[PDB]
């Protein structure tokens, strides 16, 4: 709702940042293996920015990755439905 | 509104282009350190094109980067709601 979809995103972004590191360590070559950049990666992912500096290589990494897209893209296609209503209405008044 | 969401985008695109350079200089390796390409980068970002030729490496760079996504993606998921109504209605008539 007002800021409710916002929160659920941030669960997913953290949660996902965390499991990303858990899944990706042990895979020889993974780029995505410290909690900080895992967190930036999951924003990169939920917003579908696509800079492409980080991504997963393991299977469970990609699995986490899909949850973030689904859960974040639905978050964001609802957090951005809402910065669009409140702020456009404020500037409409 | 009509072209109101448009303007707020362009504040964010400039403002963001500017702080991008401010944040990213000093970080040894940053690609994102002249005002021109900072400006193209923040379009790359607000439209989630993802060519991935530029992005931030510092923390404050990523912070700016998230503001641009949020503020631009909401802009654009409202500027493109509007090129879609006026132009589709013009071609509907």
């Amino acid at each position: 709702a007002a800021g409710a979809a916002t929160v659920l995103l941030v669960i997913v972004l953290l949660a996902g940042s965390y499991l990303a590191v858990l899944a990706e360590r042990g895979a020889p070559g993974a780029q995505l293996i410290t909690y900080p950049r895992a967190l930036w990666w999951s924003v990169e992912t939920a917003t579908t920015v696509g800079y492409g500096d980080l991504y997963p290589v393991t299977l469970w990494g990609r699995l986490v990755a899909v949850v973030v897209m689904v859960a974040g893209i639905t978050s964001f296609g609802l957090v951005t439905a809402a910065l669009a209503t409140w702020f456009v209405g404020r500037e409409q008044e | 509104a009509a072209g109101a969401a448009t303007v707020l985008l362009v504040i964010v695109l400039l403002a963001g282009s500017y702080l991008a350079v401010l944040a990213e200089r000093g970080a040894p390796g940053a690609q994102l350190i002249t005002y021109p390409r900072a400006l193209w980068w923040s379009v790359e970002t607000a439209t989630t094109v993802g060519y991935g030729d530029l992005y931030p490496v510092t923390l404050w760079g990523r912070l700016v980067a998230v503001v641009v996504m949020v503020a631009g993606i909401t802009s654009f998921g409202l500027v493109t709601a509007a090129l879609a109504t006026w132009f589709v209605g013009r071609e509907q008539e």
Partner: antibody, heavy 117, light 106 residues
Framework: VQLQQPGAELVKPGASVKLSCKAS????????IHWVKQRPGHGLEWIGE????????NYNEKIQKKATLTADKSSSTAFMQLSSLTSEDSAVYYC???????????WGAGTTVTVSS | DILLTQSPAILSVSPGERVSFSCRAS??????IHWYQQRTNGSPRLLIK???ESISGIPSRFSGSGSGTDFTLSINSVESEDIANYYC?????????FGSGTKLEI
């Protein structure tokens, strides 16, 4: 002393040995514990890391995988099971505490292992 | 397994003088290099983290430069308490790896 591990172990060849590391200080969710091996007059060889709160561990690909890592969530001590040892396995064995951000902030004083009959 | 290459293997220097150790990596690793000092009989001791950032409790003598594949630790003046082995360590791809190390001699 943030990471705190025994001084020396003596092992007959072929035998196993379990190495400890009690870790006062903070006991974060996200903390990893690593194990680096320093043969005499050599440099540091990473060996394996473990996240104790969550269980899972990861070992060095390219060395003969002798060891197996374990943890005790409520005792803040973590273990490393070196198994069937030779003399090539005698070295100092450090544990380090990596916050999750990729450097070893903290290092145990290290456990000198000697494999001889 | 990213290959961190510290040359020279040993480093002479007259005291009070700047000194630099190079750690070159087998591919670009951004800034995810971190330096450790390890004296005789002691465990290693994080000196510099993420190439440039400094650790609290470390002399201001120690300074860290570099990015990509070429990295450098530096001591703007030396004293006899710095004789030790110095390692680099990359955290940019799994597994984390260590440099071969450089000994400082005076």
């Amino acid at each position: 002393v943030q990471l705190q591990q025994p001084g020396a172990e003596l092992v007959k060849p072929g035998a196993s040995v379990k190495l400890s590391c009690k870790a006062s200080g903070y006991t974060f969710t996200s903390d990893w514990i690593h194990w680096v091996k320093q043969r005499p007059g050599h440099g540091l060889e990473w060996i394996g890391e473990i996240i104790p709160s969550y269980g899972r561990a990861n070992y060095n690909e390219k060395i003969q995988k002798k060891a197996t890592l374990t943890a005790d969530k409520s005792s803040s001590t973590a273990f490393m099971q070196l198994s069937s040892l030779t003399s090539e396995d005698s070295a100092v064995y450090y544990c380090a505490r990596e916050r999750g951000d990729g450097y070893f902030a903290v290092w145990g004083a290290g456990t000198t292992v000697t494999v001889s009959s | 397994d990213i290959l961190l290459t510290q040359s020279p293997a040993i480093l002479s220097v007259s005291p009070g003088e700047r000194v630099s150790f190079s750690c070159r990596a087998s591919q670009s690793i951004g800034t995810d290099i971190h330096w450790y000092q390890q004296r005789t009989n002691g465990s290693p001791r994080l000196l510099i983290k993420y190439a440039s950032e400094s650790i609290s409790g470390i002399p201001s003598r120690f300074s860290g430069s570099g990015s990509g594949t070429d990295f450098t630790l530096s001591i703007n003046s030396v004293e006899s308490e710095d004789i030790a082995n110095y390692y680099c360590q990359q955290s940019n791809r799994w597994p984390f790896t260590f440099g071969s190390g450089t000994k400082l001699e005076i």
